[PDB]
Structures are given as C-alpha cells and as structure tokens.
Amino acid sequence: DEFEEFHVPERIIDSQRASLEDGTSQLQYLVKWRRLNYDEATWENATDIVKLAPEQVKHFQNRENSKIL
C-alpha cells in the first residue's frame, strides 16, 4: 500500500545515528513535516523516513557530506 498523502515529510534537516553496540544502532533522521505558517519538525528513524521519504533521505544522505556549498 502507499501511506503518503496528508502526513508526509518535506525533507531532512539533520541526522542522529547513535550506535548501540549491543547488536545494532539507533538511526534517526530529523524531518520537517510540511512547512505550516510557522514551522514543524521532529526526529524519526532514518529507516522509516527512507521508505516514507526515500527521495528526501537520499538528497539528505548525500548532503551529510556538504556543509552549505
């Protein structure tokens, strides 16, 4: 199925990959849901955002190696 209509991420702003070492790691990407008149953005697993917003996580992924350029 496709769950991407009203609740959809606009793009990534930052990432938070915390290694656990117990057998896995905590990967989370900061996303900004829409723009809204004011603003709105939180943290979500980079795995879900990859499937939920693969185009954004990809553009965000390649950006991780680019500090405003």
From Swiss-Prot:
Domain Chromo: start-end pairs: 7-69
Note: Present with 1620 molecules/cell in log phase SD medium.
Biological function: ATP-dependent chromatin-remodeling factor which functions as substrate recognition component of the transcription regulatory histone acetylation (HAT) complexes SAGA and SLIK. It recognizes H3K4me. SAGA is involved in RNA polymerase II-dependent transcriptional regulation of approximately 10% of yeast genes. At the promoters, SAGA is required for recruitment of the basal transcription machinery.
Compartmental location: Nucleus
Originating organism: Saccharomyces cerevisiae (strain ATCC 204508 / S288c)
Similarity annotation: Belongs to the SNF2/RAD54 helicase family.
Protein name in the entry: Chromo domain-containing protein 1
Gene assigned in the entry: CHD1
Entry domain remark: The 2 chromodomains are involved in the binding to the histone H3 methyllysine at position 4 (H3K4me3).
Knocked-out gene: effects: Decreased sensitivity to the cytotoxic effects of 6-azauracil.
Assembly information from the UniProt record: Component of the 1.8 MDa SAGA complex, which consists of at least of TRA1, CHD1, SPT7, TAF5, ADA3, SGF73, SPT20/ADA5, SPT8, TAF12, TAF6, HFI1/ADA1, UBP8, GCN5, ADA2, SPT3, SGF29, TAF10, TAF9, SGF11 and SUS1. TAF5, TAF6, TAF9, TAF19, TAF12 and ADA1 seem to be present in 2 copies. SAGA is built of 5 distinct domains with specialized functions. Domain I (containing TRA1) probably represents the activator interaction surface.
Domain of life: Eukaryota
